[PDB]
Amino acid sequence: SNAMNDIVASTQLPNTIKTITNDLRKLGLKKGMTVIVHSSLSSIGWISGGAVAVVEALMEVITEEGTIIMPTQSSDLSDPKHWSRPPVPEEWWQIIRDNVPAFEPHITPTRAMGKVVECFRTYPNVVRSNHPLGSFAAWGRHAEEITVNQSLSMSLGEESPLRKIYDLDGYILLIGVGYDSNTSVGLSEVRSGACELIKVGAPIIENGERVWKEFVDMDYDSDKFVEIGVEFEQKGTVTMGKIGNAKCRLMKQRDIVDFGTEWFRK
């Protein structure tokens, strides 16, 4: 439950930066690590400091000489034709394309990324990549290298932060979330050459001016991510432990990405 008395009731003693730091280290997070993090704050139990405590815990373990990455997706900038949660009437679609504010990395909020991401993306020295729908944010040693020159088309492909993490043999940390939140599997979708290309649209700043920009991407499908996860855990290497009440998973990104790639091909 997300109701606060349920969250408090689910906890024996407060989670603090210190208890979270200790839990992260026991799980295997280390100084210098490159790690992309996916989370649910409520899954942990009651935390003194809320999202701030988790971000500060992560930074305390990883440090400046490591790199933290988080997806900072902004799907409400997408073309409303495809919307289902909820869908909007068809008479709104062109109004939306004409009026939805352009992606601006320092301004545009994330949607369905979680409070930990909203907190993290506003930290000083956090760098955001340039994609109106599928951006990422990063902090630490490789933050610039990982976020720079993201392509508009194939947002999760070979010219994405996912590929840069892959190149650096980075880790994926899932905090109280499952494989449907594992963005890195999108890179397996692209490399499989299986899933379908679709025409997508989003508002960007182009020539110092708002344009509704059309481009090409994959119709990424998170349901096959969960299937991959189930199989990956029966076969591949993944570490599991708890942060407060959250069941967490830590894994090498290259292991899951390569497994996913072969899975999609069959």
Instruction: Give the binding site for Cl ion (CB under 5 A).
Output: 33-34, 43, 101-102, 154, 157-158, 176, 190, 210, 246-247
| Neighbouring C-beta atoms of residue 120, cutoff 10 Å | 28
Give the side-chain half-sphere CA count within 13 A for 1. 9
Residue 180 CA to residue 174 CA, distance in Å, equals 10
User: Would the annotation count 192 as a binding residue?
Assistant: no
Contact characters 91-110, Mg ion, x per CB under 5 A: ---------------x----
Given a contact cutoff of 8 angstroms between Cβ atoms, the answer to whether 47 and 41 are in contact is yes
Q: β-strands 246-252, 239-243: how paired?
A: antiparallel
Site for a copy of itself in 20-49 (CB under 8 A): 46, 48-49
- Tokens 């299986």 label which residue? 194
Round to whole Å and give the CA distance between 266 and 257.
14
Rounded-to-integer distance, Cα 96 and Cα 177, Å? 32
Residues 2-61 binding ligand ACO (CB under 6 A) are 2-4, 7, 38-44, 46-47, 50
The two tokens of residue 266 are: 């069959």
Secondary structure tally for the chain: helices H, strands E: 11, 9
In the set 108, 135, 182, 253, which binds a copy of itself (CB under 8 A)? 108
- Residue 200 near residue 79, CB atoms below 8 Å: yes
Q: Which positions from 122 through 151 interact with a copy of itself, judged by CB under 8 A?
A: 122-124
Check the annotation: does 41 bind a ligand: yes
CB 106 to a copy of itself: min, Å: 6
For residue 10, say whether it is annotated as part of any ligand binding site: no
Task: Kindly indicate which of the ranges 94-102, 145-153, 174-182, 204-212 contains the residues binding ligand ACO, using the contact rule CB under 6 A.
Answer: 174-182
User: Could you tell me which stretch among 100-108, 164-172, 174-182, 231-239 binds a copy of itself (CB under 8 A)?
Assistant: 100-108
Report the distance separating Cα 136 and Cα 117, nearest Å: 10
The correct pick among 24, 36, 41, 53 for binding a copy of itself (CB under 8 A) is: 53
Site residues for a copy of itself, window 57-76 (CB under 8 A)?
76
To which H or E segment does residue 161 belong? helix 161-167
Strand positions, DSSP E, 73-147: 127-128, 136-140
Query: Contact residues for Mg ion (CB under 5 A)?
Result: 106, 122
Query: Contact residues for ligand ACO (CB under 6 A)?
Result: 2-4, 7, 38-44, 46-47, 50, 71, 73, 112-116, 177, 181-183, 222
Query: Contact residues for a copy of itself (CB under 8 A)?
Result: 2, 4-5, 8, 13-14, 16-18, 46, 48-53, 56, 76, 85-88, 91-92, 95-96, 99-101, 106-109, 115, 118-119, 122-124
